Structure 1
Amino acid sequence: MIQRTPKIQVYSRHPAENGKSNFLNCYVSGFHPSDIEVDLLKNGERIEKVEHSDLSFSKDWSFYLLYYTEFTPTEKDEYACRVNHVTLSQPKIVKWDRDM
């Protein structure tokens, strides 16, 4: 079967400012089949109550989903997205970089 691995971007809704409430986004796109597992991590721990968009897809039929949660960035707290998909031999972790 046609299998396409996900593209992953982790980023904030607004430019990050320490101590200011914001939204942490994990956008996964370009993938097939649609079954996918996405976690947002704070210092390596799963954030609870993450929200996500409803499954939709691009012209080439590949799927995309937005996962997101409110968060207040600080100088020291590390955030990341963890994605698992059949095309991946182990879950992929992408760290939030506030400059990307």
Structure 2
Amino acid sequence: DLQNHTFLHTVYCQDGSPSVGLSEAYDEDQLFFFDFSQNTRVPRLPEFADWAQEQGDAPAILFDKEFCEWMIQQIGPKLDGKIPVSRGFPIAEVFTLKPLEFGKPNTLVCFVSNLFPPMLTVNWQHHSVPVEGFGPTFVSAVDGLSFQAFSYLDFTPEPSDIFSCIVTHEIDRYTAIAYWVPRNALPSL
């Protein structure tokens, strides 16, 4: 009679960059993603984890890390060339965080789905001009052994604004492109 919930601790690794990561996500929103340089859990935005990087369990993590890295290390070359490498082509779409009101401050969300393997770099362009975006790019692990990612661009909407989000899939420099234009703007009050 009580609704169920999923907290998934996903330990992953691969050939290339990055070599190792760890996303944990409650209900397909992640609260944490691990840092192996600093051996600490970095927070997403759940008011930035007051409980944070409780060191209460490095045995679990550090064990999965080394084993995962062994599978990439000692299993990689034995299988390399014998079975094909699993890969998807990433899908990008961009929509607005809040409803579109001309002249009113908003944000552009670039949602990247079907990311496998999880290696990517995302660029924003305003009228096809390279423009820096707010924050970093958040990669999250999702159910079924795939990954997604988010990026964000703050801006003020003009009737003429054309924006594009560009995903580079880091495995072979493949690109996905997603365009945005203002559509069905609500009346300015």
The answer as to 2:88 corresponding to 1:35 is: no
The answer as to 2:116 corresponding to 1:45 is: no
Equivalent in the alignment of 2:167: 83
The answer to which structure has the higher helix fraction is 2
Name the CA distance, whole Å, in 2 between partners of 1:92 and 1:53: 16
Dislocated runs of 4+, deviation >3 Å: 86-90, 97-100
Q: What's the offset of the Cα at 1:6?
A: 1.0
Q: Which moved more, 1:8-17 or 1:43-52?
A: 43-52
Equivalent in the alignment of 2:156: 72
TM-score (normalizing by structure 1): 0.85
User: Which structure has the larger Rg?
Assistant: 2
How much is the aligned-residue C-alpha RMSD, in angstroms? 2.2
TM-score (normalizing by structure 2): 0.48
Q: What's the offset of the Cα at 1:94?
A: 1.2
Equivalent of 2:99 in 15, 38, 49 = 15
Deviations 1:39-66 (Å, cap 9, x if unpaired)? 1111111221432353211111111111
* Structure 2 unaligned residues grouped into runs of 5+: 1-84, 185-189
CA contact (8 A) 2:164 2:180 kept: yes
Name the CA distance, whole Å, in 1 between partners of 2:92 and 2:171: 13
SS, match of residue 23 in structure 1: strand
Q: Relative contact order, CA 8 A, sep 6+: which one is greater?
A: 1
Equivalent of 1:93 in 177, 180, 183 = 177
Matched letter for residue 38 of structure 1: V
SS, match of residue 55 in structure 1: strand
Equivalent of 1:24 in 105, 108, 118 = 108
